[PDB]
Design a protein around this ligand. Structure first.
Ligand SMILES: [Zn+2]
Ligand SMILES: [Zn+2]
Ligand SMILES: [Zn+2]
Ligand SMILES: [Zn+2]
Ligand SMILES: [Zn+2]
Ligand SMILES: [Zn+2]
Ligand SMILES: [Zn+2]
Ligand SMILES: [Zn+2]
Lengths: 182, 184, 182, 184
């Protein structure tokens, strides 16, 4: 199975178009969006090519292939525009060998862990920092941000391919971090 | 390569609950998927047979670590405080080889308000208390009916996913009420 | 200013009809309902004359005079039946010389206090125990339950009259507790 | 008796915010009532004049202890974590002698979806960015309009309750755009 992950888009049209381009070329079946989709975010500058209404038209074109959770920056007006369900604060995704716990990062995350099974995967964003590692009995995965990178990391996205979780550079496409989840 | 058991619209019926649980224990299924309306009978419904919310809670908690549930229109916060598994999520997902199952109760997204889905995906819901298993257009609809207050003259039922087939099964007979194959 | 308070009805039709009779005779302009309206409650025995669908018809007749907040036992189906807004976890009511902070008691209450002004009033239920006293710089008020009282108190309701907060017995009509707030 | 100032649909406009705050400080009003859509411009709207969310936050917090607000369709939880006063409530109330003021943003309850109210009560809302002050049927409708993005050729505005009259006032001129007496 092949899944693509994207998070903290914050209204950036160019980041969105590049994501949708890589999605189409990857062959992945679904696109998981971890929150903070249109709103740039009160405490920071507008991202490159900020254009909420256009990001909306682009994303709504693959709405039937999107799985998503509510970011701290997402609001009711956002759901009214996006043709896929974003209001759930968290959502589990059942895979053959394990579970994926999807959440933005502000309500649940590394500091407030959910009950899970050994080798399950905690998937979150919000921090804008890439992560692909084993933490205790479970795995932690954060695809970083596709628009507002932090900690010196390049804009990035995530990918699940053949039991391997990888954080990939949006432009470079070089592997930032990865871990096998067998 | 995946097996799941589905139970919906329990509404506090202890008999339905004990039976669901013995069947679950025998199924060999990885998870018990509860589609909502767990303890409350519902202001519009007459009490179910064997209405005993307090006891239903004790029983479901025995297998809490293996339950995957979604919020029903009759579920409230007191219910979440009693049950030891997450019941507040409005929807959740199951991913197979090339298709996905969209799990929801039926009052938010349903037959008359479809979520966006791809060809050959499955909308899994309860709420109506009417069993369904069929291809409706480009997607598949699946409703395992109510395990305690069936409507339309149907028997109380539950559902099962056996890799590529979804079946609605009578709770007493264990006879097939309806089933559909979701192979491309 | 004359307000009537009722809480933890839990589907009791007789309790409801008695409340509506006292409301009509009191002259009060509004009826404040603190939650837990139709559902008897998972761990409780059915109250006297349990009949949610009938409580709904009675309450909906004075819907335009009701102010309410979400009880821990209230659900989406409940809002669908009641013709007045109940989904808010809490609401503030502005009066001439002070604020009323209305909440059920499970999220906010004596143990998780909201920020308020000296002499404001914390109004809550959920415990089924009557209260009318000053605590710290603010007042605490709980009209008790009208259908399933605990502690040893009779079924009761509340009243705001002449700047005096009173907890009154549903039958006796005797004063259980009270405190002047001005 | 009762004096209140109303501001709605700020949408992150720092100039509108500083002006609202200077007027509030001079009004003598007991509370500043914010009807929603505080920091986000809204995906459907062009940025308003002087869009500076971060700064609007610092300024509104200086008077946090005197704000009474209700949630707008554009407000999110990041906004709540920044602002030091409660903004999540969908509605709240003001009680006069024999009348009731129902405060809400306008996307949940509004002109086209009325809450249950008694005769001579007031529905107070924003969201449309169109000022209103009139009796409609048996109740009164009052909308301060937007302090930053007015529609219909109207001036940026705010609102005030001075005992028994509700007025929509231009933010620059301080001239009366509309007003209604709610005496019964
Ligand atoms: Zn972010
Ligand atoms: Zn975030
Ligand atoms: Zn049901
Ligand atoms: Zn239902
Ligand atoms: Zn109660
Ligand atoms: Zn309660
Ligand atoms: Zn607006
Ligand atoms: Zn709005």
């Amino acid at each position: 199975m092949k899944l693509m992950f994207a998070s903290d888009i914050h209204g950036s049209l160019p980041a969105t178009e590049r994501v949708l381009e890589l999605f189409a070329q990857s062959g992945a079946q679904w696109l998981v969006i971890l929150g903070d989709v249109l709103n740039h975010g009160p405490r920071n500058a507008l991202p490159e090519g900020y254009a909420p209404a256009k990001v909306v038209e682009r994303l709504n074109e693959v709405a039937h292939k999107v799985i998503a959770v509510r970011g701290n920056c997402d609001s009711e007006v956002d759901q009214m525009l996006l043709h896929f369900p974003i209001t759930a604060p968290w959502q589990q995704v059942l895979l053959e060998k394990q579970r994926l716990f999807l959440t933005h990062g502000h309500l649940f995350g590394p500091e407030n862990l959910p009950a899970l099974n050994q080798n399950d995967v905690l998937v979150y964003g919000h921090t804008h920092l890439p992560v692909a590692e084993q933490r205790g009995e479970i795995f932690h995965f954060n695809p970083g941000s596709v628009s507002i990178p932090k900690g010196g990391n390049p804009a990035s996205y995530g990918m699940l391919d053949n039991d391997v979780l990888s954080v990939i550079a949006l432009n470079d496409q070089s592997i930032i971090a990865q871990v096998a989840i067998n």
